RNA sequence: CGCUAGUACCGAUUGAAUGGCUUAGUGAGGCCUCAGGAUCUGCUUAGAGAUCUCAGAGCGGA
């Protein structure tokens, strides 16, 4: 990103979070986001997807 | 700590199927035999009027 020096780089970068390394750190999964879809809780959560679909095909048989 | 994939022994389905051995009994089928005789057919006394059936009865053979 190429900052405009005229404008304050604080308001642009309010929501950003700095990290040592993406791979190493840990986020708690969501946040008080409010640019998420509010239907985030209106989503089916899945465990092991393998242990979902073989079960469902098993019930389909 | 617990839940999820993975691999071998029992064990029930009286399961339910494949073969091996084995008990006892049955055993088709040809073939060889003991009979059989549907039937078919020779010859002869012989039936009827001059290689003619008009009844049969023997002697046979397939």
CA(A47)–C1'(B41) in Å? 101
Method: cryo-EM
SS3 category, A58? helix
| Nucleotides, chain B, CB distance < 7 Å | 4-5
Q: Give dist(CA A47, CA A39) in Å, integer.
A: 19
CA(A61)–C1'(B19) in Å? 35
Q: What is the resolution of this structure in A?
A: 3.6
- Secondary structure (DSSP) of A8-39: -TTTTTSS----S-TTT----S--S-SSS-GG
Q: Give dist(CA A17, CA A12) in Å, integer.
A: 12
Q: Give dist(CA A10, CA A3) in Å, integer.
A: 11
CA A25 to chain centre: 14
Q: Is the CB of A52 under 7 A from strand B?
A: no
């Amino acid at each position: 990103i190429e900052l405009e020096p005229s404008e304050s780089a604080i308001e642009r970068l309010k929501r950003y979070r700095g990290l040592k390394n993406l791979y190493n750190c840990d986020w708690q999964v969501d946040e008080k986001d409010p640019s998420s879809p509010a239907e985030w809780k209106r989503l089916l959560r899945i465990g092991n997807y393998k242990n979902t679909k073989n079960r469902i095909i098993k019930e389909t048989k």
